[PDB]
Design a protein around this ligand. Structure first.
Ligand code: JWW
Length: 267
């Protein structure tokens, strides 16, 4: 199934499925996992649009350590892969903090090449202090494994969803302190630099259609924040789903895919 290309000097793994006209779906995972985060969604995406699933450098089948990198390379590697394939307009679907890279891509290319972006359960507020502590915990060589187990448990809550449990237990091996600390550094620095993903979207020279889909932060002020952002920004949209986990794409693939098709249809 899975293919590779050298882009910007590094091996980018991806797969490319589907041949239907219109924008191309481009899936982007969080840190420390790969395109298996979109196995559940893939049947539904690829039936609607050509779908290219993309891994970050160092995240493909080759798990050699690569040189330090951050959002800029994530964005440039991905753009360069799509250019090598001559993908014109496309819609990123990005999980969690992959969304920082997806917004950088939309910023670099403007709203005709990237007419929409979908983000899946990314903390839209400034970083909670509890979250900042985990991001520093994962940069400490002696207890990075604890910070991971701590974040993982949050994401899962009490779920009984097998897809999500297997993904985190069995399908995300092969990373360790190098990548989890990089994630810590890059994520922390994005919140410290931009304050929040919502401020980042507002710095967009020309915002494309951006939709946030999430289950996790409990219902309440978090939705009120989204209502207000949507009321001030017609390009922004959101949907709370009824899942237990911070992996809506894996837990509720059909619903998330349907939201992605709908976002594209509107743009
Ligand atoms: C285990 C399986 C991989 C899934 C994680 C990708 C999504 C994700 N990664 C993070 C990585 C480091 C720190 C915080 C993170 C976070 O808050 C996320 O939501």
């Amino acid at each position: 199934m899975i293919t590779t290309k050298t882009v910007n000097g590094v091996q980018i793994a991806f797969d490319d499925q589907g041949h239907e006209p219109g924008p191309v779906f481009v899936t982007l995972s969080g840190w420390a996992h790969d395109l298996r985060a979109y196995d559940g969604m893939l049947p539904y995406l690829r039936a609607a649009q050509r779908t290219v699933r993309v891994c970050w450098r160092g995240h493909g089948p080759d798990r050699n350590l690569v040189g330090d990198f951050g959002i800029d390379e994530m964005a440039a590697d991905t753009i360069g892969l799509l250019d090598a394939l001559e993908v014109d307009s496309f819609v990123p679907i990005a999980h969690s903090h992959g969304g920082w890279a997806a917004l950088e891509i939309a910023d670099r290319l403007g709203a005709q090449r990237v007419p929409a972006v979908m983000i899946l359960d990314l903390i839209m507020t400034p970083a909670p202090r509890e979250f900042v502590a985990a991001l520093h915990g994962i940069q400490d060589p002696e207890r990075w494994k604890e910070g991971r187990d701590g974040l993982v448990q949050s994401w899962l809550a009490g779920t009984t969803n097998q897809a999500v449990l297997d993904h985190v237990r069995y399908d995300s091996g092969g990373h360790g302190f190098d990548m989890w600390a990089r994630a810590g550094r890059v994520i922390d620095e994005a919140y410290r630099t931009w304050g929040s993903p919502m401020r980042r979207m507002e710095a967009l020279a020309e915002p494309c259609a951006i939709r946030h889909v999430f289950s996790h932060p409990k219902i309440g002020e978090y939705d009120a924040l989204h209502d207000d952002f949507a009321a001030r920004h017609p390009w922004f949209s959101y949907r709370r789903l009824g899942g237990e986990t911070a992996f809506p794409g894996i837990e509720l693939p059909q619903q998330v895919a349907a939201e992605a098709i709908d976002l594209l249809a509107g743009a």
